[PDB]
Amino acid sequence: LHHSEKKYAEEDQVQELLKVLNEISKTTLTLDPRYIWRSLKDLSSLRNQELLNAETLCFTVNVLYPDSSSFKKNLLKFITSNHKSSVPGSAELRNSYPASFYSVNTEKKTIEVTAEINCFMHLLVQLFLWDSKELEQLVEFNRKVVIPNLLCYYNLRSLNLINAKLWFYIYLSHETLARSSEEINSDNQNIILRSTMMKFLKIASLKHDNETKAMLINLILRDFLNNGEVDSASDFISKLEYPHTDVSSSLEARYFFYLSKINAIQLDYSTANEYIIAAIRKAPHNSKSLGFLQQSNKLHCCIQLLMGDIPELSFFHQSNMQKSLLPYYHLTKAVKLGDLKKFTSTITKYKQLLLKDDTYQLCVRLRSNVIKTGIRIISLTYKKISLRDICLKLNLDSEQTVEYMVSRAIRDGVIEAKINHEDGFIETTELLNIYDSEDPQQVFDERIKFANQLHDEYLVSMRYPEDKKTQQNEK
Amino acid sequence: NYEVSEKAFLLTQSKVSIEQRKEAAEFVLAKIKEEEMAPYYKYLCEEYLVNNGQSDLEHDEKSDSLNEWIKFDQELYNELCKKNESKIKELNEKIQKLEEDDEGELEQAQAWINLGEYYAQIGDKDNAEKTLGKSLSKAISTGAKIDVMLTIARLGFFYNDQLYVKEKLEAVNSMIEKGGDWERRNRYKTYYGIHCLAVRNFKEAAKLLVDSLATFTSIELTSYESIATYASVTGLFTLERTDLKSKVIDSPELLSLISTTAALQSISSLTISLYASDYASYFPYLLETYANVLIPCKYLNRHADFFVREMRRKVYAQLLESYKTLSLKSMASAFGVSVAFLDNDLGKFIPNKQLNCVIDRVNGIVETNRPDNKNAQYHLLVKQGDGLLTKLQKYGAAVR
C-alpha cells in the first residue's frame, strides 16, 4: 500500500526533472525550462496534498545530499513523523544509468552533479512550507541555509532562474510571521532580510537576467512602503535598473502599482495617474489576479478625487466588485455635492474598513478636496458671480474665508479666473478659442511619437518563433 | 392581462389622490372572478416594499397604508383550488387523450399553446415554457408561432420580469430568423426595446415606440388611444426640435389622435407651445403631464423624474440659440422661475457638461456660450481623439 504510493509520485518528479536536465547541458536553452517552471508551481502544489508527504522523502535518497541530510528530518520533526522504511538507501532508482546520475562516478567525486541537484532541492522545500503553512522555527532555519549557499554557488544564465522564485518565498513567509505574532526576535530577522536583498541585487546586475532583478525590485519597493521612507525608494527608482524586456505576465502590473503609491504623496498626480491606468491593462482578468485588481481599482478612484476632478461613477456599478466599492461612492458624492457634514459622517463609519488598505490617511486630506471641487462646480456655472453668492450655496463661514479659498483654486491653473475686490464679483478669464495657440500642436507631436512607438515595438518582433522552425528540417 | 397591469400599476407610487388606487382596485376584483389574477397580486407585494406590500392577507401577516380592498377573501380562497382544477386537471386530461388517439398535428400544438396561456395565470413558470416547448416541435408554419411569441412576451408583461424573459424573446428570432411580414418583423424588435426600457437605454429603445404605436396596435390587450401616451411623451423626448416640425406637429395619425381623448396633452399642448418658442404657457401644461400621464402609465412611470433632467436642459438650450445674450428679467420675473430659485435648475446642468450658459448676478444679463467655428473640430476632437490610443493599447499591449 504505502510502497506503491512513494514510487508513483517520484517517477513523475524525475520525468519532469529529466526534461529540464538535458536542456541546460547544451548551450543555453534556458528559455524553454522557464516556461516549464511556470506550470511546475501549479502541478506541484496539487501533488503535495496527494500521497501525503512521502514523495519528497525518497527523492533525497535517490540523488546525493550535500546539505539535505538533516533538513528533511527537521522539516518532518514538527509534524510528529511516522517512520516507515525510514532508513536511508531503501529506494534506489539510479541503477547505473547516464541520465540516472551514475553513482560510481558520483561517489568517486570525479564529476560534480551537485550544481543542478542542490539548487533544485531548495525549490521543493519552499513549496511544502507554503502548502503546509509551517511557521516559527521552520521559517528562520531555512533562511540561514539558502542565503549562504547562494553566495558560495555562482549561478550561470540558466541557474539564475532557480533562486529567482526562492526570494519571493523568503519575503512572503517573513511577512506572515510578523502579522501572526509580535515577538522580540521578529525584527532581528527583518534587519538581515533588508541587507540581504541589496547584496544579491549587486551581483544580479552583471548577470542581466530579466526575472532575477525584476523579482527583487517589487519585493524591495514593498518593504519601503511599509516603513514609509521615500528617500530609499526615490534614488532606487532613478537608476532605472528594472528590466523591461521579459517580465512575463506576473510583474507587468506589479511595478506600476508601486509608482502610483509613491507619487501619491509627492503631490504630482500627472505621472501617477498613468501608472495606475497601465497597471489595470497589464493585469490579467482571471480569478488569481482578482486580489490585485481589487486593491488597484480602489487606488485609482482615490487618485482622481485628489486631482480635483470628479471621475466616472459608472465603474462603481457595472463592475462585479461593487460590494467592496460601496464606501468610495459616498466619498465622491460628498465631494461633488460639497456637503460639509456628509463627508465627516461618511469617513467615521467606514474608518475601520479604510485601515486595512491604509487609504484613510488620504481620505483625511479629501476634506480640502470638498472645497476644491465645490468651487469648480459653482465657477463654471456663473462666469460673474457675487462674493456673497458662494457662501449661500455652500454654507461657508464669511466673505473673507471664501476670498482666500477661491485664490487657492487658480494656483495650478485649474479654474483660470480672477477675483475683483473693488467690483465685488469673481470673473472667469477663460475665453476658450485655444485653437489659435500652439496647444493643438503640442498634443499632435506626442501622437506621432506614440504611433511610432507602437511602430518601433512592431518594428522588430517577428523571427522569434521562426528561429526554431526554419533551422529544423520541415516536410 | 393589460387591464390588471395598467390599473393596478398605481399601487407603486401615487402621490396625487387616494381614490386613484381605490378606483383602480375595483377593476382588479372584477376581472379576477373570470380569469385568475392571483399570481399578479402576489408579485405586487414581492416587488415594492413598505408601501403596498402589507395589503396581502396571507404572505406575511401585516396591515399598512390606505388599502384594505386588495386581498383574497374567503370566496377567492376557496376558488383558488376551483380554478386550478379547471386550468390543470380539466385541460391536461383532454389534451392527453389527443396524444393517445393521434388526432391532427398543429391542432395538438395549438392545444399546448392555448394551455400555456393558463400557466401565466397559474404562477408556475417552469411549466409555462415547457408546454410551449412541446408545441414548438409540432409547429410547422408561422401561423402557430404567432401565439408562441405572444405568450412568452406576457411572461415579462404579467410578472414584470425583465431578466429571464428577454432571453427567451431573443431565442426565437436568433435560432430561426425569418419574420414573415414586416408587421411581425417589428414585433420581434418591439419586445427587444421593451426590456431595454427597464435598464433605461434612453433613445436607443424609445425610438421604436413612436414608430410602432403610430401604425398598428395589437388591439387584443388594449386600445389605440390608451397606450398612445407612451409615444406622445417620448416623441419630443428622444427626437430633436429640428425634426418635430415635419413629424410630430404634422402627422396623419397624431393630429387625429388628439381628438379621441384629452388625456394626452403632449403632441398638442406641449408640441405647439414648444414650436412657438413660448414657455409662458408651455410650463403649466407640464403640471398635468406627470400627474395624469406619466404616473398612470407603466413604462412612463418607470422613468418619471428621468424625463425632466433631459427635458429641462433642452428647453432652455433652444432659447439660448435664438439670442446672443438674454435677460434675467425674462427668466426670473416672467415665465418658469424666480430669481433665487433659478440656481437649482441650471446650477447642476453645467457641471455635467449638459449645456453652456452664463448668468449675471449683478446686472442680470444672461449670456450664451457659442462655440462658433470651434464645435467638434477643435475642442470635442481632443476628447474623443484620446480614445484612439486608449482602446488600441488596452488589449493590444498584452498581445495574446
Binding site: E312, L313, S314, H317, Q318 | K15, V199, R200, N201, F202, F283, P284, L286, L287, Y290, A291, L294, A304, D305, F306, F307, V308, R309, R312, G336, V337, S338, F341, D345
Partner: peptide
C-alpha cells in the same frame, strides 16, 4: 447607463411642479 440611474433623486416632478403652482399665484 447605470450612472444615470442612481444620480436621479426624488426631486423634480413631484417637487418642482408643486412650486410652479404657487409661483404663478405670487405674480
Amino acid at each position: 447607463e447605470n450612472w444615470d440611474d442612481v444620480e436621479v433623486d426624488d426631486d423634480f416632478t413631484n417637487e418642482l411642479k408643486a412650486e410652479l403652482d404657487r409661483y404663478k399665484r405670487e405674480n
